[PDB]
Design a protein around this ligand. Structure first.
Ligand SMILES: [Zn+2]
Lengths: 76, 32, 72
């Protein structure tokens, strides 16, 4: 299915994903399209920051949903 | 109480505490 | 454990804490380091105000997490 990722600069990225994909998987897809390392990515949906080890289905992220990408380096 | 409701950031949609005036995630101001 | 505490004025205070520290303990550490009385402190993380009797671990606060400090 298709989902979208919107950036702080207002641009829309289109991804192809499955409901069983993890948030970590989604960040890898963003790296593919945008060159941004997963450790620099935070994803927001329905007002919440998404956790790497959960799936899209866990968050009820269905087709044509829009996530928001914030660039912020993960802790060490 | 004075502070009102949590606010969704215009820039990233994060749902912020009403005492914060910059987004906890992206640091953009609530108001502009 | 290192955490950051960002004030409303843009300062990032760096604290040494343990995941088992209570919020009350964290406020005491902020008092020791910065001089702010604990009763004047409100701590916020992931959009929510943190409560005194809980621990950092209760809120899943870990290495290099950023909290926000608002003063009364
Ligand atoms: Zn934001």
């Amino acid at each position: 299915m298709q989902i979208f990722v919107k950036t702080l600069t207002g641009k829309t990225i289109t991804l192809e994903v499955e409901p069983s994909d993890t948030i970590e998987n989604v960040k890898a897809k963003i790296q593919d399209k945008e060159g941004i390392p997963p450790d620099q990515q935070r994803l927001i949906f329905a007002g919440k920051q998404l956790e790497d080890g959960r799936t899209l289905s866990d968050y009820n992220i269905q087709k044509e949903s829009t996530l928001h990408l914030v660039l912020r380096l993960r802790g060490g | 109480d004075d502070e009102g409701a949590q606010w969704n950031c215009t820039a990233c949609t994060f749902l912020n505490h009403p005492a914060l005036i910059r987004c906890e995630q992206c640091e953009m101001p609530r108001h502009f």
